[PDB]
Structure 1
Amino acid sequence: QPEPDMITIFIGTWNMGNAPPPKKITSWFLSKGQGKTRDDSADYIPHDIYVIGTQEDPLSEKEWLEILKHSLQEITSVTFKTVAIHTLWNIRIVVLAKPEHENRISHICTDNVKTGIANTLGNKGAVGVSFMFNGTSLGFVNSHLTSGSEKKLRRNQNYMNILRFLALGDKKLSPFNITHRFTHLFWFGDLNYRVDLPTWEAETIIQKIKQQQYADLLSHDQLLTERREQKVFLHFEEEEITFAPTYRFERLTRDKYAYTKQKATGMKYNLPSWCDRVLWKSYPLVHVVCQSYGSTSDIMTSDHSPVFATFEAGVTSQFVSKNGPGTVDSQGQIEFLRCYATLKTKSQTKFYLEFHSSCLESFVKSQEGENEEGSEGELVVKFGETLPKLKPIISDPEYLLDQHILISIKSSDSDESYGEGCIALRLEATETQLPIYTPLTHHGELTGHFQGEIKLQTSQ
């Protein structure tokens, strides 16, 4: 039985509004309703992995697992295995996989982050799951961010706290937050960003929704605008939204948006909004294609509609050679030429690099670079031809061209990372000097750039 080079992943996010679900929720897992929907001809074809994020979930883990497993069994006639389940308050993530994947899945991690302080600590935050699928690392975050149209800045802060403090994936990757630890990272939830239009425009917005005219609403979506201004979710992608706002509905129908201020809302308006979202970030030049992104029309127990997204995702096999794992492959090497970091920092410490990759026996520390002043005020750290030659465990090009090198630039004085990024080895050529580039981030914000040339030697 051959190891896969692709899998499909289902992502669901649903704020259940503290109400039990209806008896049938299969439309969610089938990607049927509004938006980019899945073809009827695929209905019996299981996804490899289902990741379900709920918010305001009133069910026990046992109660929800029974509903999810029985749903998928009805759709596919497959009894899914539970990979992981983790709950923080009423925020939950479930990961289910086809039984044939049970011995492909390992290093399962779970964690949560509680956002806010005092007043604002006690119900918002995130849960997450990671694991290896053969040679590919996967991470999943379900976040319920701060509510309210006038709290977009708080949501951006919630985002930064979650990616700083959620402890998933390989702990040896100590300079790197979750936005660098995974081949594929999916981040979803009730992100709670709103359509920023005046309250007096509520009925005009409803009109637009009835006409399926979303353009003048999406141009005021806070998540799209904050992302465009690099305030949040830097280097994440989102599929185009072609479904109606998923919040705030009257329960038991989808015919009515309930937007007016009520004691129950703290006298806040809830203009129709795309609160419920799926974003992803994959390593450079790895196959990842969104094949659905939409909302259900027939699940009406909550004031939110469920959202689904599905993805094709490239995966690699657990490679063994005569040599690595457990030694190097003298036929393999990675060389860096003419490399320099450009940093936005005002500081004047020396810097060194760390190279981290599962193609190395352990991470590699460089010598300090040479600081120069850039023409427009910046710090340029030059490495020239000084960077160590990296010695991969396997030289086979079928393996090595699929790998990635994480780079951290660290202060000599403090050993703290000032920037993190990632370089693909999916090169146009081997034994050839080729340009490389990555942006550098720290706490998920842009801090600089790393660029230079690479020369990759494989056994071919």
Structure 2
Amino acid sequence: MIQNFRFFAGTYNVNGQSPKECLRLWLSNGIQAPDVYCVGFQELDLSKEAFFFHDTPKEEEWFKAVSEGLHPDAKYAKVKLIRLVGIMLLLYVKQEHAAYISEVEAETVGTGIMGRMGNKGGVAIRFQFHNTSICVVNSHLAAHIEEYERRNQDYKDICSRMQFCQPDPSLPPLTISNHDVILWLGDLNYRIEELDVEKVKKLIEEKDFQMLYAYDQLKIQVAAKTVFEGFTEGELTFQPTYKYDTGSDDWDTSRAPAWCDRILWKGKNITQLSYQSHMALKTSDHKPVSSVFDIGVRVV
């Protein structure tokens, strides 16, 4: 029997900052309490120290910040936390679902310096929920403005190198694609091309996000089948989420605005209820993005 549960997916590039703001706006702003929360960060800590010895007080800081921000109408249990340098993913479920979560595994893949360090890359948590297999990936891909090939390479390398082991020590490992349900979120860093920074801002003024999409690097590459084969993205009905002046909604361009921050998915029995950014949070040069899904899970 398929029963629907509500999944919240969120991605936020916090530009090396500690949380200054209440996250309720992002994580529980006029939504029903999700059954499951998948919350992704990039650039959690930008220090060389963090890049070097992993430890950083930004982890407890954003964890406290997310937990305080979850929907107040339910109690949530943290299932798993995973981080590679500045890339962190948190998985929470309502306390009443905890017993039905199993085979939780978490892995990381660095795809930055030398094609292997964690300045860029991916982290993932997969698990079983009742009798449905789910994998959630948070990734931070190459930032070069022109050279999207580097993002495609990061994406190809997360897919080929991310391997989850299994209790049975005689079985092959699982890859990201070996799941009934895949959610992929992150600062994917694809930008807008050809169009002038003037036109790109003006298009954003009059809210004509359809025309702009035709020049979005991610749209183009997905159609070219160089990444995200089989994935869907909901219509982008919110303005690009990068790059803003910290503490405001004005632009900064050291580089047109861009839909850096995205959530895609593939699987049967997945319906997307919403796809938003959250302008009111001004702690970072990105805005956070969120999506709620009704996902059908097989319950036996």
Q: What TM-score do the two structures reach when normalised by structure 2?
A: 0.90
Query: In 1, Cα distance between the equivalents of 2:174 and 2:44?
Result: 31
How many pairs are equivalent? 287
Deviations 1:238-287 (A, max 9, x none): 11111000001111111x1112x3xxxxxxxx2100000000111xxx31
**Alignment match, 2:256:** 271
Query: In 1, Cα distance between the equivalents of 2:185 and 2:198?
Result: 29
1:28 to 26, 41, 45: 26
Code of the aligned partner of 2:38: V
Query: In 2, Cα distance between the equivalents of 1:106 and 1:176?
Result: 15
Indicate if the aligned counterparts of 1:61 and 1:85 stay in contact, CA closer than 8 A: no
Code of the aligned partner of 2:191: R
Code of the aligned partner of 2:88: R
Code of the aligned partner of 1:277: R
**Alignment match, 2:282:** 300
Indicate if the aligned counterparts of 1:69 and 1:79 stay in contact, CA closer than 8 A: no
Indicate if the aligned counterparts of 1:12 and 1:51 stay in contact, CA closer than 8 A: yes
Greater Rg over alpha carbons, structure: 1
**Aligned CA distance change for structure 1 residues 146 and 120 (closer, same or farther; 3 Å):** farther
Query: In 1, Cα distance between the equivalents of 2:274 and 2:248?
Result: 24
Query: In 2, Cα distance between the equivalents of 1:50 and 1:190?
Result: 18
Query: In 2, Cα distance between the equivalents of 1:86 and 1:191?
Result: 18
The Cα shift of 1:4 comes to 7.2
State the SS of the aligned residue for 2:99.
coil
Query: In 2, Cα distance between the equivalents of 1:125 and 1:164?
Result: 12
Query: In 1, Cα distance between the equivalents of 2:22 and 2:122?
Result: 27
The Cα shift of 1:182 comes to 0.9
**Aligned CA distance change for structure 1 residues 272 and 174 (closer, same or farther; 3 Å):** same
Whether 1:280 aligns to 2:265 is yes
Query: In 1, Cα distance between the equivalents of 2:144 and 2:240?
Result: 15
**Alignment match, 1:55:** 42
2:62 to 51, 64, 80: 64
State the SS of the aligned residue for 1:290.
strand
State the SS of the aligned residue for 1:138.
strand
The Cα shift of 1:215 comes to 2.1
Code of the aligned partner of 2:264: L
State the SS of the aligned residue for 1:247.
coil
Query: In 2, Cα distance between the equivalents of 1:202 and 1:86?
Result: 37
Whether 1:313 aligns to 2:295 is yes
Query: In 2, Cα distance between the equivalents of 1:156 and 1:119?
Result: 12
Deviations 1:28-58 (A, max 9, x none): 113x5xxxxxxx4xx3x31010011000113
Indicate if the aligned counterparts of 2:164 and 2:173 stay in contact, CA closer than 8 A: no
The Cα shift of 1:146 comes to 0.3
Gap runs ≥5 in structure 2: 46-56
Query: In 2, Cα distance between the equivalents of 1:173 and 1:65?
Result: 34
Indicate if the aligned counterparts of 1:7 and 1:48 stay in contact, CA closer than 8 A: yes
Query: In 2, Cα distance between the equivalents of 1:119 and 1:182?
Result: 26
Query: In 1, Cα distance between the equivalents of 2:246 and 2:104?
Result: 37
**Alignment match, 2:221:** 226
The Cα shift of 1:224 comes to 0.3
RCO (CA 8 Å, sep 6+): is it higher in 1 or 2? 2
**Alignment match, 2:52:** none
Query: In 2, Cα distance between the equivalents of 1:70 and 1:79?
Result: 11
C-alpha RMSD over aligned residues: 1.9
1:155 to 148, 151, 154: 151
**Alignment match, 2:50:** none
Deviations 1:58-97 (A, max 9, x none): 353322221111112xx42323101000110010000011
State the SS of the aligned residue for 1:309.
strand
Query: In 2, Cα distance between the equivalents of 1:63 and 1:175?
Result: 33
Query: In 2, Cα distance between the equivalents of 1:306 and 1:79?
Result: 23
Indicate if the aligned counterparts of 2:127 and 2:135 stay in contact, CA closer than 8 A: yes
Whether 1:98 aligns to 2:94 is yes
Query: In 2, Cα distance between the equivalents of 1:116 and 1:24?
Result: 32
Alignment of 1:420-439 (within 5 A): none
Q: Which has the higher helix share?
A: 2
Indicate if the aligned counterparts of 2:163 and 2:173 stay in contact, CA closer than 8 A: no
Indicate if the aligned counterparts of 1:247 and 1:305 stay in contact, CA closer than 8 A: yes
**Alignment match, 2:9:** 11
Query: In 1, Cα distance between the equivalents of 2:97 and 2:83?
Result: 24
Query: In 2, Cα distance between the equivalents of 1:173 and 1:214?
Result: 47
Indicate if the aligned counterparts of 1:187 and 1:279 stay in contact, CA closer than 8 A: yes
Code of the aligned partner of 2:220: T
2:193 to 186, 191, 196: 196
- Percent identity of the aligned residues? 33
